[PDB]
């Protein structure tokens, strides 16, 4: 009961809480304190090979009971101690008793009256250490605690043969070489069925058209659902022409094969959920600093993995799966890439089997059977989403409460962190409260579609952002978080956030993999990094070709009419005559698309502006979507909906549509949105943010110009250079970078002198490395960089290709 | 966090070297003596001008020229890999929001403290963020740098502070004990590739993009920078590695983000256009401005050193006080009974 | 310190009360407690954290320049000259009364002189500073050559447009702008080791030798002699100099009998004028009267025995505004060239602004604000053999054309006269200018008047002005420029600014600032340099209202332009300032923002308004470059504050309750000879100018954190001033009272002077009043006199029957301060003066009590008062009442006795 001095105050890295502010009829602080002493031998508790993580953790816990203390002492408004609560020791506890209106019964110089008894649980609630405290807004007296096994703290000083990284350090006795891990070899034509690939529109729909060419015609595509009880009768994106590398067998993403000992979870979804003891758990409780009975304990709450899970979006069953399906499908495992929105090659914090699943095989659908009629079907899943021990104590942590209800937000994610493992706060749990506070309920929901309802009008920040999403949750955002507050009267949450995959948006072309082995490795799982990478040279004319088309020119002699690679000069030019043979005239249906033979080609931007899942001003509009971070990318904070975050239902409902389409038919007349059903309420929680904010309040080369004002750690200098012939140049901005020349011969050759620059004379800094035929011919480049395939000779202009 | 990695083709070490003179041509970006990759580099930015800010060649991080970089060269065909700044923060580092009025917030992130001071009302000519920098090189040369942050908190002298304490880093999971470990798993370390490319051409060196070449063996010409990808073998070569990085020994203690006015933040001279383009005039509203930051809202944290250990902080609406000491006689009340 | 601390003479400080009475004993001579000789005099003051900082100057210091060797600057050990100046701290080592004990005592040492900076003052030369007497004409100089015959020379304007070309003239339409003025004649200039004249000639542009040092001695000294002779008690005709030996004592220049002492010791001797401290630091700045070329920053951690190094201004660079305003002051200072051998100046050697005539100093947190004047440095051609040039100073307008897009920026920023000449006079249509009506083949192409011919061979070396013009020549740009009177023909009429004559500097300098300047001081071997970016710098004109009859709709010059000036100069064409004081506003801001403070400063015919942003201790700025840097804000006097003498300046208070500074003038500081050696007979009296703030302060609601027009200032002539009594004090006890101390013959007398809506006036009856002291520290109580305690009457003890008050216990009526109001009748002295009454126990059945009354000061006073922990025993009454009894807890119990004992 009364005041020990051997425990003192500490930070939890996962959270940073350690104190609480009492504010109203009596102000003061709780605040987290543990035992001083050194040398805690965790080692000690013994691991053998022939069993699971349970039985450990609990001895673990066993010895930490034994080895440390920890106690939420009350202190007054000048810091001065109170009394002790050491939650595993104290004497007589026991709840709180109500009146029949359920009021605590209470007198302020007696306390509260107690029943006598402990709350229900109280056999495993006292192993666990309180991690964060929180008061009631309306009602005196009540405040809120969360507790979690010591494991979460201790995680780091566990052994470390059992709380390992993701990849291995291996012994190195060859010398290191980091090309031995990553699986490499590029596709090809299979030598027994050419064949196959999409037929050339033999006759071209007049449409009141005039002009003719002599190139090569369009690609047919077609899907029908026919009569037969398992296959289509058509299915032209389930087409395979293309195959694997054979290199001492085939080359794929085969999880046995190279994670001889893979890494796992402490524990699983379904046993934290089980094991009671495991499990997070909030607590409502009563205090009053100079009463006789001044603390006594309200009700307890699991914080129930299952009821996150559970309320998880139906294409999470899923995860190896998406909207484009069988085209994207192969075009990723052809260039040995995660298929899906979050498969555990890149993200095996989620999965309850870890790095033991890290393949594409089985996504929930039928593929790979010897028809492509025959694949494109609904089936039962291999692996689910999940939320396993690291993943589950980064989304524990940041506490706030709102009328009768109370948030958890959240942490950083240090509980769990490893140098190559990035667990997150993925979302957001509620308890609230009920009869008058006499009864209680828990759930929880994912960020994907708490942030469904942002646009471009609420930031005032740079406009675009990989942040979008649609009718599926295929977008998954995640956050370390730094935690949630009332400014003023708004309140506002702050962290760090994951984007979209914005280094994968431009694509390979199939066989160049041999030459390009870092973009692939940062598909891999193997390069953990989320910066773009200036790589044009190897790319497709388009991200979006389907793999039936590729094969159209294998020796490059034509230039790939329909597929080829991003050069941005050599791009086919439309002119106004050219138009009728590429793309006015191939009208599509019901059952007929068509790959263009046209030439398509742009740069970084140009690829992002097209595929990124970018923000409009719309909500559910966003039709692409690539793949998830590896870790946050992005600064973020916001103001919430308080009203809204206490006013919806505890319960989310999602239904059919938000399914994926049961068959490629479906898929192919794939509709982009639709209503609500009516047992449904998924559309309601769309709104809980009011507004965003991102970095600086600049638009366009103005916000690289603060990227080069600010100061590096290491050395305290500016990236923009400037306070000290021959000097050197800024990094972020273009401003003094090459020479300056006027945009007058660029593109279109008009609107440069009066609708570009305030001024007469349209000068832009041409920046680090260019192109021009002299220092006095400063202005644009003609067409003269005309390249070859191979040895063949140049491009070729004035030839009846290209006429 | 500091964190951006950079391509490199040659280390510090015998034979290997690159040089600040008469090895790059800031005037003569035309040509490959410019050094401009136009492979595998960072988008939107610049290598060579990254590798000139960390210092990684000539004498501005360190006492003598650590003579590592990139090179472009028509004289044969080339590898290169990326390497880390030197720094071992990361972006999941963020610690307490903390609330400083009706409209003000802000939080530590890393080394810095960052504030959102204008989100709630926005105004034209204010870039809506202020910015306090760490200065501790003790701290920022670490190798698992945030278990060193013991907190952050309002105070009720109307700034936010934080804590830190020198005495609390810890070494990596193994001291290598048997083996020269190349790989060391480390929060800024990756399996970055080899990239392989073509020899550059001497003249009109930009006029087409840089071709790449067959990767799957160019290992073995490399070996020293394979070495350079974990970061303490970077720290090593930069002579922050060990105690030559010197200053205080201890000196845990308390920091304070930069001063304060209603001032602060207003750019409105940098902002908007009559004759230019707007990162331009910006760029020379900046440029008289490099020595005098704090009115952009932009600089370094303020630090006092105590004595004994940090181990965190507990809060009231009147005082802070550090380990549970700081408490005082209440003066001013003691007449009232 | 509930005390006020009056500057007796020289060297002796006392302690007043608020009753304008001295504490006893606490007259202390600080000069002889500070251990320095009887020739040291106290120079500044200031408290900080309750301890007392002195700045002391010797009489008999004599400083020396050797342009050879290197320790080139030193003081004069043979005979005794080594007189150093000092700044000491004092604190107040008793509790009861002033004993003044001495703490620290740092020596302010000469600067150390590099090589680089040696051979600029080698050359360098120093115009003798101007006086009270120092007319428009004796400041005026010969006008030197024209930019076209500088360079195409004797010869002809029909090949100015064929040659401008080949001198990188290109498009000028100036061939007749001035390249400055001559040296031959005028005020005398003269390097460091020589000494300034007691003459200064009536029209410069006849009557002086200017820089002809060896002109002066053989020939013209002995005709301004006969001319002009020193009093001796002689007189004699003034017909071409006048005389100011006495008027030059006066601003604080020293003598060996009838001559100045060389140029450098009177540098050092001004130098040493005001001082300002901080927690880390003591800065040390120079007078208003002088230019000054360096301050000190001490750390206040220097070791015992330490000789702390003044900074270099020519090493300090200031934020001008933007780079070009820098640039314009740097061109002028004088040639650079890679090309040119031997010729040495602080620009051609990479120095800036060598030289500035300081306002004054003082701190505000741990922040030195400073203000004051670029002094005039230009180049001038010290050449010798055919340089056409010769013995010319090389200066320009550099006045903004008529053309210039206007809105501030545009306007500081004008290409106009940055490199070289420009302007000087126009007859477009028939509309007459000075300045150039524009600024097509390409851009009009400014150069620096030394013909490339001679670019190799000519000696261009730095001189300093005693003024803020850079440029003398007596043509009528040079007035315009001086009086503010060019202006555009817009449809605004905005007036164009110079950017090198009357240029106002100001600053708020952080302690890394001070920091550097020590670092740039203790420099091994180089000049190291500082930046001070918290500065921005201001063209401030005298008014053309302080001027008669000049000429517009035979153009007037500085040699025929008539004064009229109100306030103690001749001159009516060279600015001034004077006491910069910093103050924090006592006017709530909003919680979560820091305090507000500004500064004032008095300037020839107006207040300035320095603004800061508390918040990160900048200058006020505000988002739009169009107004103006609202860090600075003019607001000009009325006839009767430019009636004051502006050079008998005393001293400058501010008074943190009022929010208010109070500037004080002792017309006893006047010199006893006017130029003529006329007795000057207006030496009696004083006067103090009121300074208050004008306009929405910073961050008073949410509207305030942004402002876009700059608070500002207002100078009041109060009503508190005399030409007939000698000032002691004037103690601001609050902004409804002022005490004045004087002598009328030779003892003290103490007037009271009353707020009335603004204006003070004198009251009689609370002078006499609170003169009445009987020799006691306060003023005496009377009980039947509205004395300065106002008067009480007391109740007659039967009150306490009649209203029944018997009946409570005395600790009841003792704890009920609303019935002890009801024991007497007060009548205020003056309005809203207050009074309560302090209860005693005296015994179980009665009580004393004591007038508890407000004094002028809004203070409240009662029997065991104290100033300086000494009781005061004003003699306030004691009153007792007496007769109360227990309250009744004995009801029950006695009406239980009584009727038991009839029963």
């Known amino acids: 009961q009364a005041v020990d001095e051997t425990l003192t105050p500490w930070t939890w890295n996962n959270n940073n809480f350690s104190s609480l502010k009492i504010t109203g009829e009596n102000p003061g602080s709780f605040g987290l304190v543990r035992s001083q002493n050194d040398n805690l031998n965790i080692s000690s508790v013994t691991k053998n090979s022939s069993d699971d993580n349970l039985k450990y953790l609990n001895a673990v816990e066993k010895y930490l009971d034994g080895q440390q203390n920890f106690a939420i002492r009350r202190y007054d408004n000048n810091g001065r101690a109170l009394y002790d609560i050491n939650l595993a020791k104290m004497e007589n506890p026991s709840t709180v008793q109500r009146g029949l209106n359920g009021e605590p019964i209470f007198d302020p110089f007696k306390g509260f009256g107690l029943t006598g008894n402990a709350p229900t649980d109280w056999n495993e609630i006292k192993g666990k250490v309180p991690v964060e405290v929180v008061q009631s807004p309306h009602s005196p007296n009540l405040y809120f605690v969360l507790l979690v096994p010591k494991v979460a703290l201790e995680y ?139 603390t006594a304990f309200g009700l307890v709450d699991h914080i129930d993995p299952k009821k996150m899970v559970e309320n998880y979006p139906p294409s999470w069953k899923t995860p190896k799966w998406n909207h484009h399906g069988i085209w994207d499908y192969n075009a990723r495992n052809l260039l040995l890439q995660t298929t899906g929105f979050f498969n555990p090659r890149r993200h095996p914090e989620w999965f309850d089997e870890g790095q033991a699943k890290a393949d594409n095989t089985s996504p929930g659908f039928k593929v790979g059977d010897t028809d492509h009629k025959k694949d494109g079907f609904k089936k039962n899943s291999s692996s689910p989403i999940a939320l396993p021990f690291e993943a589950y104590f980064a989304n524990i942590g940041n506490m706030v409460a709102i009328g009768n209800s109370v948030f958890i937000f959240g942490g950083n994610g240090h509980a769990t962190k490893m140098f190559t493992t990035n667990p997150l706060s993925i979302g957001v749990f509620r308890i609230k409260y009920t009869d008058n506070f006499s009864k209680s309920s828990v759930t929880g929901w994912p960020y994907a579609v708490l942030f469904g309802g942002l646009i471009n009008p609420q930031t005032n920040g740079l406009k675009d952002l990989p942040l979008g999403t649609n009718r599926w949750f295929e977008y998954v955002p995640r956050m370390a978080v730094s935690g949630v507050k009332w400014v003023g009267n708004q309140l506002v949450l702050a962290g760090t956030l994951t984007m979209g995959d914005t280094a994968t948006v431009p694509r390979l072309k199939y066989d160049q993999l041999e030459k390009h082995l870092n973009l692939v490795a940062q598909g891999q799982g193997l390069l953990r990094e989320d910066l773009q990478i200036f790589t044009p040279y190897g790319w497709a004319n388009r991200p979006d070709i389907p793999v039936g088309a590729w094969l159209q020119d294998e020796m490059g002699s034509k230039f790939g009419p329909h597929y080829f690679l991003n050069n941005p000069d050599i791009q086919d030019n439309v002119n106004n005559d050219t138009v009728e043979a590429l793309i006015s005239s191939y009208k599509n249906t019901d059952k007929l698309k068509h790959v263009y033979p046209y030439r398509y080609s742009g740069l970084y931007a140009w690829q992002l502006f097209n595929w990124s899942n970018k923000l409009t001003n719309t909500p559910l509009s966003a039709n692409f979507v690539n793949e998830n971070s590896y870790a946050p990318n992005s600064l973020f904070a916001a103001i919430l909906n308080e009203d809204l975050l206490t006013g919806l239902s505890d319960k989310i409902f999602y239904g059919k549509e938000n399914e994926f389409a049961e068959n490629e038919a479906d898929r192919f007349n794939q509709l982009l949105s639709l209503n609500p059903n009516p047992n449904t309420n998924w559309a309601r929680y769309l709104n809980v943010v009011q507004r965003f904010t991102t970095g600086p309040n600049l638009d366009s080369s103005t916000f690289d110009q603060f990227l080069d004002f600010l100061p590096w750690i290491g050395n305290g200098k500016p990236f923009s250079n400037s306070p000290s012939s021959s000097t050197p140049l800024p990094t972020f901005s273009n401003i003094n970078v090459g020479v300056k020349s006027m945009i007058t011969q660029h593109l279109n050759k008009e609107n440069t002198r009066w609708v570009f620059i305030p001024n007469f004379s349209p000068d832009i800094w041409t920046g680090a490395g260019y192109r021009v035929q002299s220092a006095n011919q400063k202005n644009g480049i003609p067409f003269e960089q005309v390249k070859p395939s191979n040895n063949s000779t140049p491009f070729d202009p004035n030839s009846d290709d290209n006429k | 966090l500091g964190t951006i990695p950079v391509l490199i083709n040659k280390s510090g070490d015998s034979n290997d070297q690159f040089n600040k003179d008469s090895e790059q041509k800031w005037d003569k970006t035309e040509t490959n003596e410019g050094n401009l990759p136009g492979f595998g580099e960072v988008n939107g930015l610049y290598n060579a001008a990254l590798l000139h800010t960390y210092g990684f060649f000539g004498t501005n991080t360190n006492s003598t020229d650590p003579k590592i970089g990139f090179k472009a060269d028509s004289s044969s065909s080339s590898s290169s890999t990326l390497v880390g700044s030197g720094l071992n923060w990361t972006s999941q580092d963020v610690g307490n929001l903390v609330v400083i009025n009706d409209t003000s917030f802000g939080f530590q992130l890393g080394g810095w403290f960052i504030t959102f001071t204008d989100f709630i009302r926005p105004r034209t000519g204010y870039l809506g963020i202020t910015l306090s920098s760490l200065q501790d090189q003790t701290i920022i040369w670490a190798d698992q740098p945030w278990t060193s942050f013991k907190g952050s908190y309002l105070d009720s002298d109307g700034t936010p502070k934080s804590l830190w304490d020198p005495t609390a880093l810890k070494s990596l999971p193994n001291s290598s004990t048997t083996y020269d470990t190349n790989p060391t798993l480390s929060p800024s370390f990756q399996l970055y590739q080899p990239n392989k490319v073509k020899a550059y051409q001497t003249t009109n060196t930009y006029n087409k993009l840089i071709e790449p070449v067959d990767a799957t063996s160019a290992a073995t010409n490399m070996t020293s920078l394979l070495k350079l990808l974990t970061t303490k073998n970077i720290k090593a070569k930069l002579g922050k590695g060990t105690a030559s990085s010197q200053g205080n020994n201890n000196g845990g203690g308390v920091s304070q983000t930069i001063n304060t006015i209603t001032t602060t933040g207003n750019i409105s001279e940098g902002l908007k256009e009559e004759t230019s383009i707007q990162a331009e005039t910006l760029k020379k509203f900046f440029d008289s401005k490099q020595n005098n930051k704090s009115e952009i809202g932009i600089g370094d944290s303020t630090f006092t050193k105590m004595d004994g250990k940090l181990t965190g902080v507990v809060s009231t609406p009147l005082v802070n006080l550090i380990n549970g000491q700081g408490a005082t006689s209440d003066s001013d009340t003691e007449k009232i009974s | 310190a509930n005390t006020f601390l009056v500057k007796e003479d020289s060297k002796n400080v006392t302690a007043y009360t608020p009753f304008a009475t001295p504490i006893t004993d606490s007259k202390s001579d600080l000069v002889s407690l500070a251990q320095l000789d009887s020739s040291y005099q106290i120079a500044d003051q200031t408290i900080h954290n309750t301890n007392l900082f002195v700045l002391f100057k010797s009489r008999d210091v004599k400083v020396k320049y050797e342009s050879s060797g290197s320790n080139n600057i030193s003081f004069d050990s043979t005979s005794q000259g080594e007189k150093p100046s000092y700044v000491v701290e004092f604190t107040n080592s008793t509790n009861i009364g002033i004993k003044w004990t001495m703490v620290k005592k740092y020596q302010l040492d000469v600067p150390n002189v590099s090589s680089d900076m040696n051979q600029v003052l080698k050359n360098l030369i120093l115009e003798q500073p101007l006086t009270k007497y120092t007319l428009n004409s004796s400041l005026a100089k010969e006008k030197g050559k024209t930019q076209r015959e500088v360079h195409l020379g004797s010869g002809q304007a029909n090949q100015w447009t064929s040659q401008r070309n080949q001198h990188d003239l290109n498009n000028n339409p100036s061939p007749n702008a001035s390249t400055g003025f001559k040296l031959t004649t005028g005020n005398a200039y003269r390097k460091l080791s020589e000494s300034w004249p007691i003459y200064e000639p009536i029209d410069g542009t006849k009557q002086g030798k200017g820089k002809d040092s060896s002109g002066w001695s053989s020939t013209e000294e002995n005709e301004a002699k006969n001319d002009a002779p020193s009093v001796s008690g002689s007189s004699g005709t003034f017909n071409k100099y006048l005389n100011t030996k006495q008027a030059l004592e006066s601003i604080g220049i020293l003598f060996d009998d009838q001559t100045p002492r060389n140029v450098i010791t009177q540098l050092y001797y001004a130098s040493t004028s005001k001082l300002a401290v901080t927690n880390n630091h003591i800065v040390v700045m120079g007078n208003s009267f002088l230019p000054s070329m360096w301050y000190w920053v001490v750390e206040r951690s220097a070791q015992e025995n330490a000789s702390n190094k003044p900074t270099w201004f020519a090493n300090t660079n200031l934020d001008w505004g933007e780079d070009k305003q820098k640039q314009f002051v740097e061109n002028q200072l004088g040639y650079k060239e890679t090309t040119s051998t031997n010729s040495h100046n602080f620009h051609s050697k990479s120095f800036t602004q060598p030289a500035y005539l300081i306002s004054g100093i003082d701190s505000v947190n741990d922040q030195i604000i400073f203000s004051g004047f670029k002094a005039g440095s230009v180049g001038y051609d010290s050449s010798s053999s055919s340089s056409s040039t010769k013995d010319q100073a090389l200066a320009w307008s550099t006045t903004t054309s008529l053309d210039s897009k206007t809105g501030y920026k545009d306007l500081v920023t004008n290409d106009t006269g940055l490199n070289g000449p420009i302007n000087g006079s126009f007859s477009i249509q028939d509309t007459f200018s000075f300045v150039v009506p524009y600024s097509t083949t390409g851009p009009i192409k400014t150069a620096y008047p030394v013909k490339k011919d001679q670019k190799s061979t000519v000696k261009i070396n730095s001189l300093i002005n005693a003024t803020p013009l850079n440029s003398y020549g007596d043509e009528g740009i040079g007035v315009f420029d001086a009086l503010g009177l060019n202006y555009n023909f817009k449809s605004n009429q905005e007036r164009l600014p110079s950017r090198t004559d009357q240029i106002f500097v100001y600053g708020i300098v952080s302690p890394n600032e001070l920091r550097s300047a020590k670092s740039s001081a203790d420099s091994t071997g180089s000049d190291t ?110 006839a009767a504050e430019s009636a004051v003498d502006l050079t008998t300046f005393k001293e400058v208070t501010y008074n943190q309750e009022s929010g208010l500074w109070s500037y004080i003038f002792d017309s006893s500081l006047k010199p006893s000879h006017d130029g003529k050696q006329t007795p000057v007979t207006d030496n009696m009296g004083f006067s103090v100018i009121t300074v208050s703030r004008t306009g929405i302060e910073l961050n008073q609601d949410q509207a305030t954190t942004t402002l876009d027009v700059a608070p500002s200032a207002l100078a009041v002539q109060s009503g508190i001033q005399s030409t007939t009594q000698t000032l002691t004090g004037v103690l601001p006890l609050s902004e409804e009272f002022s005490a004045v101390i004087a002598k009328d013959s030779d003892q003290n007398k103490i007037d009271i002077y009353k707020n009335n809506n603004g204006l003070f006036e004198i009251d009689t009856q609370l002078s006499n009043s609170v003169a009445t002291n009987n020799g006691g520290l306060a003023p005496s109580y009377t009980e039947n006199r509205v004395d300065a305690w106002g008067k009480v009457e007391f109740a007659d003890n039967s009150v306490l029957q009649a209203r029944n008050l018997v009946d409570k216990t005395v600790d009841e009526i003792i704890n009920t301060p609303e019935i002890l109001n009801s024991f007497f009748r007060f009548t205020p002295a003056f309005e809203d003066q207050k009074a309560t009454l302090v209860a005693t126990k005296q015994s179980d059945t009665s009580l004393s009590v004591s007038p508890r009354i407000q004094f002028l000061d809004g203070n409240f006073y009662d029997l065991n008062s104290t100033i300086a922990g000494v009781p005061l025993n004003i003699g306030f009454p004691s009153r007792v009442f007496a007769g109360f009894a227990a309250l009744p807890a004995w009801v029950i119990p006695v009406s239980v006795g009584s009727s038991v004992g009839i029963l």
Request: proline residues 5%; charged residues 20%.
């Open chain 1, 156 to 294: 780091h000083n566990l052994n470390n043969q059992v709380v390992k990284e993701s990849l291995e350090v291996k012994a190195t006795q060859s010398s290191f070489n980091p090309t031995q891990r990553l699986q490499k070899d590029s596709p090809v034509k299979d030598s027994s069925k050419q064949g196959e690939k999409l037929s050339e529109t033999t006759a071209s729909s007049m449409s009141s058209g005039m002009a003719t060419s002599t190139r090569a015609k369009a690609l047919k595509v077609e899907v029908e659902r026919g009569s037969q009880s398992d296959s289509l009768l058509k299915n032209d994106f389930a087409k395979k022409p293309l195959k694997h590398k054979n290199s001492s067998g085939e080359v794929k993403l085969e999880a046995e094969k190279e994670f001889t000992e893979a890494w796992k979870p402490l524990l699983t979804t379904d046993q934290i959920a089980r094991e009671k003891g495991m499990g997070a758990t909030v607590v409502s409780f009563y205090d009053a600093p100079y009463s006789e009975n001044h």
């Open chain 3, 529 to 638: 340099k500082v930046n001070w970016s918290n500065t921005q710098s201001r063209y401030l004109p005298v008014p053309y209202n302080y001027s008669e009859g000049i000429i517009d709709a035979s153009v007037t010059t500085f040699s025929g332009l008539k004064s009229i000036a109100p306030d103690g100069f001749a001159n009516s064409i060279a600015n001034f300032s004077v006491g910069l004081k910093a103050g924090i506003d006592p006017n709530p801001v909003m919680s979560g923002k820091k305090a507000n403070y500004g500064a004032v400063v008095l300037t020839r015919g107006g207040v300035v308004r320095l603004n800061f942003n508390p918040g990160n201790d900048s200058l006020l700025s505000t988002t739009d470059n169009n107004i103006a840097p609202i860090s600075f804000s003019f607001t000009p006097f009325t």
